Scaffold this motif. Structure first.
Motif, PDB file in Angstrom:
ATOM      1  N   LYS A   1      54.301  42.185  45.085  1.00  0.00           N
ATOM      2  CA  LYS A   1      54.165  43.167  44.000  1.00  0.00           C
ATOM      3  C   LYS A   1      52.704  43.386  43.620  1.00  0.00           C
ATOM      4  O   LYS A   1      52.280  44.531  43.497  1.00  0.00           O
ATOM      5  CB  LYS A   1      54.982  42.741  42.775  1.00  0.00           C
ATOM      6  CG  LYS A   1      56.471  43.040  42.968  1.00  0.00           C
ATOM      7  CD  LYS A   1      57.251  42.638  41.713  1.00  0.00           C
ATOM      8  CE  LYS A   1      58.729  42.981  41.906  1.00  0.00           C
ATOM      9  NZ  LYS A   1      59.517  42.670  40.690  1.00  0.00           N
ATOM     10  N   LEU A   2      51.931  42.308  43.477  1.00  0.00           N
ATOM     11  CA  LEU A   2      50.496  42.391  43.192  1.00  0.00           C
ATOM     12  C   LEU A   2      49.738  43.144  44.291  1.00  0.00           C
ATOM     13  O   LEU A   2      48.958  44.036  43.963  1.00  0.00           O
ATOM     14  CB  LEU A   2      49.927  40.974  42.997  1.00  0.00           C
ATOM     15  CG  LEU A   2      50.167  40.398  41.592  1.00  0.00           C
ATOM     16  CD1 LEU A   2      49.887  38.895  41.589  1.00  0.00           C
ATOM     17  CD2 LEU A   2      49.240  41.052  40.564  1.00  0.00           C
ATOM     18  N   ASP A   3      50.008  42.841  45.563  1.00  0.00           N
ATOM     19  CA  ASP A   3      49.420  43.554  46.706  1.00  0.00           C
ATOM     20  C   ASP A   3      49.800  45.046  46.684  1.00  0.00           C
ATOM     21  O   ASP A   3      48.934  45.895  46.882  1.00  0.00           O
ATOM     22  CB  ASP A   3      49.863  42.901  48.040  1.00  0.00           C
ATOM     23  CG  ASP A   3      48.769  42.163  48.834  1.00  0.00           C
ATOM     24  OD1 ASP A   3      47.630  42.006  48.334  1.00  0.00           O
ATOM     25  OD2 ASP A   3      49.091  41.745  49.974  1.00  0.00           O
ATOM     26  N   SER A   4      51.065  45.387  46.391  1.00  0.00           N
ATOM     27  CA  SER A   4      51.514  46.790  46.325  1.00  0.00           C
ATOM     28  C   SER A   4      50.838  47.575  45.197  1.00  0.00           C
ATOM     29  O   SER A   4      50.240  48.617  45.457  1.00  0.00           O
ATOM     30  CB  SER A   4      53.042  46.898  46.241  1.00  0.00           C
ATOM     31  OG  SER A   4      53.589  46.362  45.051  1.00  0.00           O
TER      32      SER A   4
ATOM     33  N   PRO B   1      47.550  49.095  29.913  1.00  0.00           N
ATOM     34  CA  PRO B   1      48.837  49.702  30.321  1.00  0.00           C
ATOM     35  C   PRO B   1      49.464  49.119  31.602  1.00  0.00           C
ATOM     36  O   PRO B   1      48.769  48.539  32.445  1.00  0.00           O
ATOM     37  CB  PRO B   1      48.548  51.197  30.541  1.00  0.00           C
ATOM     38  CG  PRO B   1      47.105  51.391  30.084  1.00  0.00           C
ATOM     39  CD  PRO B   1      46.493  50.013  30.285  1.00  0.00           C
ATOM     40  N   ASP B   2      50.775  49.326  31.764  1.00  0.00           N
ATOM     41  CA  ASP B   2      51.504  48.954  32.982  1.00  0.00           C
ATOM     42  C   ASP B   2      51.020  49.794  34.177  1.00  0.00           C
ATOM     43  O   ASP B   2      50.589  50.932  33.993  1.00  0.00           O
ATOM     44  CB  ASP B   2      53.021  49.093  32.763  1.00  0.00           C
ATOM     45  CG  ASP B   2      53.845  48.260  33.754  1.00  0.00           C
ATOM     46  OD1 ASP B   2      53.227  47.624  34.644  1.00  0.00           O
ATOM     47  OD2 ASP B   2      55.078  48.231  33.567  1.00  0.00           O
ATOM     48  N   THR B   3      51.063  49.262  35.402  1.00  0.00           N
ATOM     49  CA  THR B   3      50.463  49.942  36.570  1.00  0.00           C
ATOM     50  C   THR B   3      51.141  51.275  36.868  1.00  0.00           C
ATOM     51  O   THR B   3      50.442  52.262  37.081  1.00  0.00           O
ATOM     52  CB  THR B   3      50.442  49.095  37.857  1.00  0.00           C
ATOM     53  OG1 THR B   3      50.762  47.742  37.613  1.00  0.00           O
ATOM     54  CG2 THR B   3      49.041  49.122  38.469  1.00  0.00           C
TER      55      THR B   3
ATOM     56  N   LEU C   1      43.688  38.736  43.230  1.00  0.00           N
ATOM     57  CA  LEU C   1      44.359  40.043  43.161  1.00  0.00           C
ATOM     58  C   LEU C   1      44.423  40.585  41.726  1.00  0.00           C
ATOM     59  O   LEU C   1      44.130  41.756  41.496  1.00  0.00           O
ATOM     60  CB  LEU C   1      45.781  39.937  43.741  1.00  0.00           C
ATOM     61  CG  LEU C   1      45.862  39.711  45.261  1.00  0.00           C
ATOM     62  CD1 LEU C   1      47.333  39.556  45.645  1.00  0.00           C
ATOM     63  CD2 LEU C   1      45.271  40.882  46.046  1.00  0.00           C
ATOM     64  N   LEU C   2      44.746  39.734  40.749  1.00  0.00           N
ATOM     65  CA  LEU C   2      44.765  40.098  39.328  1.00  0.00           C
ATOM     66  C   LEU C   2      43.392  40.543  38.806  1.00  0.00           C
ATOM     67  O   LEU C   2      43.330  41.487  38.017  1.00  0.00           O
ATOM     68  CB  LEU C   2      45.275  38.901  38.510  1.00  0.00           C
ATOM     69  CG  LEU C   2      46.806  38.837  38.410  1.00  0.00           C
ATOM     70  CD1 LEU C   2      47.235  37.448  37.947  1.00  0.00           C
ATOM     71  CD2 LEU C   2      47.322  39.846  37.379  1.00  0.00           C
ATOM     72  N   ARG C   3      42.300  39.896  39.240  1.00  0.00           N
ATOM     73  CA  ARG C   3      40.930  40.308  38.881  1.00  0.00           C
ATOM     74  C   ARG C   3      40.578  41.667  39.483  1.00  0.00           C
ATOM     75  O   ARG C   3      40.082  42.531  38.766  1.00  0.00           O
ATOM     76  CB  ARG C   3      39.909  39.236  39.294  1.00  0.00           C
ATOM     77  CG  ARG C   3      40.018  37.979  38.414  1.00  0.00           C
ATOM     78  CD  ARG C   3      38.948  36.926  38.723  1.00  0.00           C
ATOM     79  NE  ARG C   3      38.965  36.503  40.132  1.00  0.00           N
ATOM     80  CZ  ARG C   3      38.250  35.527  40.647  1.00  0.00           C
ATOM     81  NH1 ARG C   3      37.701  34.600  39.913  1.00  0.00           N
ATOM     82  NH2 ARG C   3      38.032  35.495  41.925  1.00  0.00           N
TER      83      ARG C   3
END
Lengths: 50, 51, 253, 50, 172
Positions: A1-4, B13-15, C228-230
């Motif tokens: 999900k993070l990668d997408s 915000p949400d993606t 990835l979060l950063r």
């Protein structure tokens, strides 16, 4: 999900892959074209006043 | 649990909401701002003829 | 600090210790290094691990002594079975038949003699089974000439059967050795135990390598979502603060 | 390709070991059938003593 | 908190003996790590003590059975079974040492055959698992490196974009 989510948001922000798109390309073109036409109108106005 | 807490701190915000806001903004510039600029270009051309 | 973490995690693989835990607690890191020689690689006390290794060595010595006698006993059993099957085939010589019957009788009398002998109980008070004494079984033993001849012939058959059993062991481990001559097979038998012990040591080393790679994989799986979060945070800032707000206001004006 | 070679080598080893186990088992089964005839012979000799 | 602290101080005194306890930073995290280590060591020391005392018992039982078999073979076969040739005794030692390496119950083919199969199967299964795990670890390193390069690119492009936006705000 993070990668997408990272890929989708990156592809939207980098449509030509290498440059961060801040302004809509269509709008950026119209700004340049209006700028040029207004510079011509200013030249005609200065010439007639002269 | 560290990763989920980090996701919850970054989510305003949400993606999907951000992608939608970006798409809606892109459409607004095309429908309103671009045809306003084109009208101003055509008006400048008429004002050059009036010269 | 990284070397200290790597040393403590290698010896105390059950401890979740972060690099931040050692950076904030430098004297605690010294206590863990001082504990690492007092704790064995297994988390048990180093003294208890030495006592375990001494008690293992003593067991291994007694087991080696037992196994030498066990191998001979089991070879005599296997030989008696093979001769008894060939006797049912009618493929025994008269001499092998005398040897098989003489050896079987000597073994049966000695086994049964041990079932009667409470060797340590004084003879006055021990009720024997069926009222039989060791003497009553000695009368069922072959003639003393036949016993001596069985014992002398046995030594050759036991060496032949030891060679055969070694060759079976080698040929199951390394089935390609069946096409090899007896001299080459004998040289490979002399390395069979060391080859099995090296294979077992290779298994232990690959199990240690497995645990070390698994610990490294888990550490990378913890770091990767945070990177990835950063990156997502930086892209969200570019989208929300720069594009939708700051640039949109510039373009309007 | 090394993994395929390793698995081919292991397959050939298991084929050879299974053939050997089947030889041991067939020899043992023939010994066991005759050892049953032996159990009946020793069972008869035991009835003779009874 | 006070019970965990007392258990750690007691355990550390037992482990260090007469050595002076090194000073350390006493906080929640260091006490939790020391508490887990103390519980794990106490559990492991109990388990090791039970194994050590069983190995002592087993050593006495195997010695007793070794003597029984030796004397049985001496009564049945006479002292002839100990007089093997130098090659007979080398073959005997290799069967014994092979069975010890495999930790067998006895020297039967019924014990040796499965032990050689299990050893061979576990060795290939662990080598395969190690190749799969080394491939995952290499793949995840590549993804992590690409994500770290992306992080650095995004930091630079965001900063250039902020500088450009501040310049255009001043012109606006």
């Amino acid at each position: 999900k993070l990668d997408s989510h990272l890929k989708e948001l990156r592809d939207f922000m980098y449509p030509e892959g290498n440059t961060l798109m801040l302004t809509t390309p269509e709008l950026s073109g119209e700004f340049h074209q209006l700028g040029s036409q207004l510079e011509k109108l200013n030249h005609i106005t200065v010439e007639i006043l002269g | 649990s560290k990763t989920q807490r980090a996701l919850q701190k970054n989510t305003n915000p949400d993606t999907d909401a951000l992608l939608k806001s970006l798409s809606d903004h892109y459409s607004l510039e095309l429908d309103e701002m671009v045809p306003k600029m084109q009208r101003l270009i055509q008006q400048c051309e008429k004002h050059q003829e009036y010269g | 600090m990284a070397q200290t973490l790597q040393y403590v995690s290698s010896r105390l693989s059950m401890l979740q210790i972060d690099e931040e835990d050692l950076e904030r607690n430098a004297q605690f890191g010294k206590v863990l290094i001082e504990l690492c020689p007092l704790l064995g690689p297994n988390g048990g006390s180093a003294n208890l691990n030495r006592e375990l290794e001494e008690t293992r060595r003593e067991l291994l010595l007694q087991r080696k002594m037992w196994m030498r006698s066990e191998v001979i006993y089991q070879l005599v059993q296997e030989m008696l079975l093979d001769l008894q099957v060939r006797k049912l085939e009618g493929s025994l010589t008269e001499e092998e038949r005398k040897f098989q019957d003489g050896l079987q009788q000597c073994m049966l009398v000695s086994e049964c003699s041990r079932l009667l002998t409470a060797d340590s109980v004084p003879p006055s008070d021990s009720t024997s089974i069926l009222g039989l004494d060791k003497q009553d079984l000695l009368d069922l033993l072959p003639p003393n000439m036949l016993v001596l001849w069985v014992r002398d012939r046995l030594q050759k058959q036991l060496e032949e059967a030891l060679k055969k059993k070694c060759f079976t062991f080698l040929s199951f481990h390394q089935p390609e050795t069946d096409e090899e001559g007896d001299v080459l097979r004998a040289a490979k038998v002399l390395r069979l135990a060391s080859t099995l012990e090296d294979e077992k040591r290779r298994l232990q080393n690959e199990q240690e390598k497995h645990q070390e790679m698994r610990a490294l994989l888990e550490k990378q799986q913890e770091i990767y979502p945070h990177v990835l979060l950063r990156c997502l945070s930086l892209l969200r800032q570019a989208a929300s603060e720069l594009r939708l707000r700051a640039q949109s206001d510039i373009d309007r004006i | 390709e090394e993994e395929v070679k390793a698995l081919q080598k292991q397959k050939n080893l298991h084929i050879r070991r299974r053939n050997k186990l089947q030889m041991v088992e067939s020899g043992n089964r023939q010994m066991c059938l005759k050892s049953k005839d032996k159990e009946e012979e020793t069972g008869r000799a035991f009835q003779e003593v009874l | 908190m006070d019970e965990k602290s007392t258990k750690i101080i007691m355990w550390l005194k037992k482990m260090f003996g007469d050595k002076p306890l090194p000073p350390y930073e006493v906080n929640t995290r260091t006490m939790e790590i020391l508490y887990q280590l103390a519980e794990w060591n106490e559990a492991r020391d109990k388990d090791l003590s039970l194994v050590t005392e069983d190995l002592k018992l087993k050593s006495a039982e195997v010695k007793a059975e070794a003597k029984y078999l030796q004397d049985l073979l001496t009564e049945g076969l006479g002292p002839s079974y100990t007089n093997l040739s130098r090659m007979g005794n080398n073959y005997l030692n290799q069967i014994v040492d092979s069975c010890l390496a495999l930790e067998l119950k006895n020297s039967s083919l019924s014990s040796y055959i499965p032990a050689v199969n299990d050893l061979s199967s576990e060795l290939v299964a662990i080598e395969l698992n190690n190749q799969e795990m080394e491939a995952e670890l290499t793949s995840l390193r590549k993804k992590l490196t690409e994500a770290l390069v992306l992080e650095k690119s995004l930091e630079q492009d965001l900063k250039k974009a902020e500088e450009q936006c501040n310049f255009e705000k001043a012109k606006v």
